[PDB]
Design a protein around this ligand. Structure first.
Ligand code: HEM
Ligand SMILES: C[C@H](CCC(=O)O)[C@H]1CC[C@H]2[C@@H]3[C@H](O)C[C@@H]4C[C@H](O)CC[C@]4(C)[C@H]3C[C@H](O)[C@]12C
Ligand SMILES: C[C@H](CCC(=O)O)[C@H]1CC[C@H]2[C@@H]3[C@H](O)C[C@@H]4C[C@H](O)CC[C@]4(C)[C@H]3C[C@H](O)[C@]12C
Ligand SMILES: C[C@H](CCC(=O)O)[C@H]1CC[C@H]2[C@@H]3[C@H](O)C[C@@H]4C[C@H](O)CC[C@]4(C)[C@H]3C[C@H](O)[C@]12C
Ligand SMILES: C[C@H](CCC(=O)O)[C@H]1CC[C@H]2[C@@H]3[C@H](O)C[C@@H]4C[C@H](O)CC[C@]4(C)[C@H]3C[C@H](O)[C@]12C
Ligand SMILES: C[C@H](CCC(=O)O)[C@H]1CC[C@H]2[C@@H]3[C@H](O)C[C@@H]4C[C@H](O)CC[C@]4(C)[C@H]3C[C@H](O)[C@]12C
Ligand code: FES
Ligand code: FES
Lengths: 359, 359
């Protein structure tokens, strides 16, 4: 039977093999939205060529590539399976992967969905907390696609642009935190400090009004309320790059600061991404937890397991789509408000693309 | 009969009259935990003298003084009437006002509480969201008092150091937002953009690990969930002073930014303070919502009423103290964790002061 409802899972993605690193970076330094460089059409290929060696080396340290596609596919298969039983009126359901910087690209996914003659398409961001640099970029790509291809969508669109406090996402995080707490020696369990870590943002982005920090913060509170405030905590930020000011505290400085102040039992919790990637496997596990940890002498530092293939996460994904469908919403109320200091004209067009959908 | 349980309501305070300004600024500039100045004992008095006129002028624009003590007293009286009925066993309760920088000073209040021969003392911060610069400072003052007077307390201490998501606090905020939305012309009600505004912090404080931003963000989320996300919103920050980097977006820049982008119906919501003060009466009402709103024609800009004398807020206070008593807690779990990059030696001693209290 023909696919009726399409679910486009959006993520920035990552290179599957070391050889995909160059093109991954090239597309990154070419995204007019997220970056502005003089004659960016010539600087990009150059910069990409320069950073490739260093980035390839990071992925080599974690096994040779990104596992995002593998986990995305599995979560997607589990979601569809549940949806066909949750919403028969919109079945059969089919998931598509739309990576912003690697294959399958957002554009390629859209072409395929259109080919499958779907009745409705749902842009489902895999980023629970909204950032104009992540979900916004992916949504802009959908608008730009149809605008460039000079055509109108043959299917009905709508978007699940954020879900920072979905009860099942919160339950998943809490469950992974609790089981990681069981791996610390029992005599130090209540002494453990929880560090929620999320990818940072340059202060120029935070200062224009990006929704991200406030939403990541909201996720942290829900998770801690569910854990009944069993351990003390702080929300810190990682992955800062360059000489410009980024939102802090920085995760690495915090780990080291805590140790120097007698808190040597730390639990790291990636609270802003749903699966393993360079941020957790390399940055946290290798850069920090190993080298940095082997410094100021930590007693125990562990990292909560990423959601990955957790069956309960697949249920969360399905419940979100199901609720989205019965709600008949086109996008969140939050998407109807661009950054108070937004200076990108595509943002407004993208918003209208969704709020203006037929039906 | 004599008071059995004392509730010390902590706030930074504000000058009652124009004449109290100078001493207000002086105590501020002499505080070593908040400010490091060369030959401070020399400069402090001087700077105080220089900035007094400019700040007296600000208070003159709002009536000649701060109403903080009036509202704090009203809230305190209401809280006590309820406590005496909610917790008969904790005999008569009495509230004391402990302002950090104005009379009645924290020290003076503690002196009176101990003169009253109280059995139990509760350091109740009036800041829902914890900041080392606000609640932290007030708690440090309690510890320093006993360390200075070279004696130990004659009362059993404990603290309510934060309550960012208390259900009744949330209901009060939501109720005031809704009633204010009713004051907008009906045709622009759903077009209204909600700007939650909280006092900002220097990025140097944020980057050391201050809990404030994340807690303020948590309060915004609960208020919006209770409002069922009826309108779009953003959390912005006000009161920045100086050339250094502070956490943005800045409230004024956001108001101007929104207008220039077609969103001319705005509802300001002071989300980090419980009563009117210089921040709302002067900053938001005068320098922003009046002048700023005279360059880029705004259609409607209103400000939700501060909690002030709302009866439901007195009930929230009483409920917090009552729950605190029934739980036997000495402080939140969060206070047992100082900033990852904390560089103030007193912070650890202050926390120990509370976690080590008898019984
Ligand atoms: C808000 C502004 C942001 C900027 C400017 C930014 C910038 C960048 C840049 C330049 C890279 C390439 C770094 C390199 O090649 O060494 C990168 C990679 C990446 N970013 Fe972002 N990013 C932002 C936000 C985010 C967010 C919110 C996430 C979500 C977790 C994220 C996740 C990643 C990941 C997973 C990579 C791949 C790194 C690698 O493969 O080595 N980024 N980002
Ligand atoms: C001036 C511009 C900042 C853009 C802005 O206003 O935000 C910055 C951003 C990217 C920078 C470039 C990239 O970092 C790549 C190169 C790095 C080299 O060390 C200097 C030249 C180099 C070619 C940089 C020149 C200049 O500092 C750039 C072009
Ligand atoms: C780290 C990287 C330099 C690559 C390299 O030469 O090794 C540089 C090149 C382009 C830079 C970006 C661009 O200058 C655009 C943005 C400028 C903002 O002030 C900070 C974030 C911002 C998004 C920059 C982040 C970072 O400094 C980048 C990504
Ligand atoms: C250098 C120091 C910053 C402290 C620090 O954060 O490291 C700043 C804080 C207070 C400043 C002083 C106060 O603003 C008072 C004076 C203001 C005058 O315009 C300049 C001299 C003046 C006497 C300032 C000298 C210098 O800029 C000071 C002393
Ligand atoms: C009044 C003075 C402004 C100097 C001037 O331009 O005249 C400002 C500058 C820094 C301010 C302080 C800082 O923002 C730190 C604290 C922030 C809290 O929300 C209130 C007390 C608090 C301790 C502030 C008191 C007062 O508003 C200060 C001291
Ligand atoms: C110490 C703190 C953070 C410094 C930083 O960002 O590294 C800074 C930020 C804002 C500063 C204050 C503001 O600039 C307002 C006042 C300016 C006067 O010249 C000195 C006192 C004054 C009240 C400053 C004291 C101190 O330098 C503050 C409080
Ligand atoms: S950059 Fe946030 S809406 Fe445009
Ligand atoms: S400055 Fe935050 S605990 Fe010391």
């Amino acid at each position: 039977r023909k696919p009726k409802t399409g679910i486009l899972m959006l993520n920035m993605g990552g290179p599957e093999t070391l050889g995909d690193v160059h093109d991954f970076l090239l597309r990154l330094f070419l995204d007019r939205d997220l970056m502005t460089l003089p004659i960016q059409n010539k600087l990009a290929p150059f910069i990409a060529k320069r950073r490739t060696p260093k980035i390839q080396e990071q992925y080599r340290r974690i096994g040779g590539g990104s596992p995002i596609k593998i986990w995305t596919s599995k979560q997607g298969e589990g979601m569809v399976k549940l949806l066909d039983e949750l919403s028969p009126n919109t079945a059969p359901h089919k998931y598509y992967i739309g990576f912003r910087y690697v294959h399958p690209l957002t554009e390629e996914a859209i072409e395929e969905m259109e080919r499958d003659g779907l009745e409705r398409a749902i842009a489902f961001t895999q980023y629970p907390q909204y950032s104009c640099s992540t979900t916004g970029s992916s949504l802009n790509a959908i608008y730009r696609y149809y605008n460039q291809v000079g055509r109108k969508p043959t299917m009905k669109w709508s978007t699940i642009d954020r879900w920072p406090t979905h009860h099942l996402l919160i339950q998943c995080f809490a469950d992974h935190i609790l089981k990681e707490l069981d791996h610390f020696p029992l005599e130090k369990r209540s002494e453990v400090v929880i560090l929620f870590s999320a990818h940072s943002l340059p202060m120029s982005v935070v200062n224009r009004g990006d929704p991200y920090p406030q939403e990541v913060s909201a996720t942290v509170q829900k998770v801690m309320e569910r854990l009944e405030y069993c351990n003390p905590y702080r929300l810190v930020w990682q992955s800062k790059v360059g000489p410009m000011p980024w939102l802090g505290p920085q995760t690495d400085e915090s780990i080291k600061g805590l140790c120097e102040r007698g808190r040597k039992n730390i639990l790291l919790v990636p609270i802003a991404f749903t699966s393993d990637h360079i941020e957790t496997l390399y940055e946290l596990d290798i850069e920090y937890s190993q080298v940095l940890a082997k410094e100021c002498g930590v007693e125990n530092i562990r990292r909560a397991e990423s959601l990955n293939g957790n069956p309960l996460f697949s249920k969360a994904l399905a419940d979100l789509v199901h609720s989205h469908i019965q709600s008949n919403e086109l996008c969140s109320k939050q998407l109807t408000l661009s950054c108070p200091l937004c200076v990108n004209p595509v943002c407004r067009e993208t918003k209208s693309f969704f709020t203006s959908q037929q039906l």
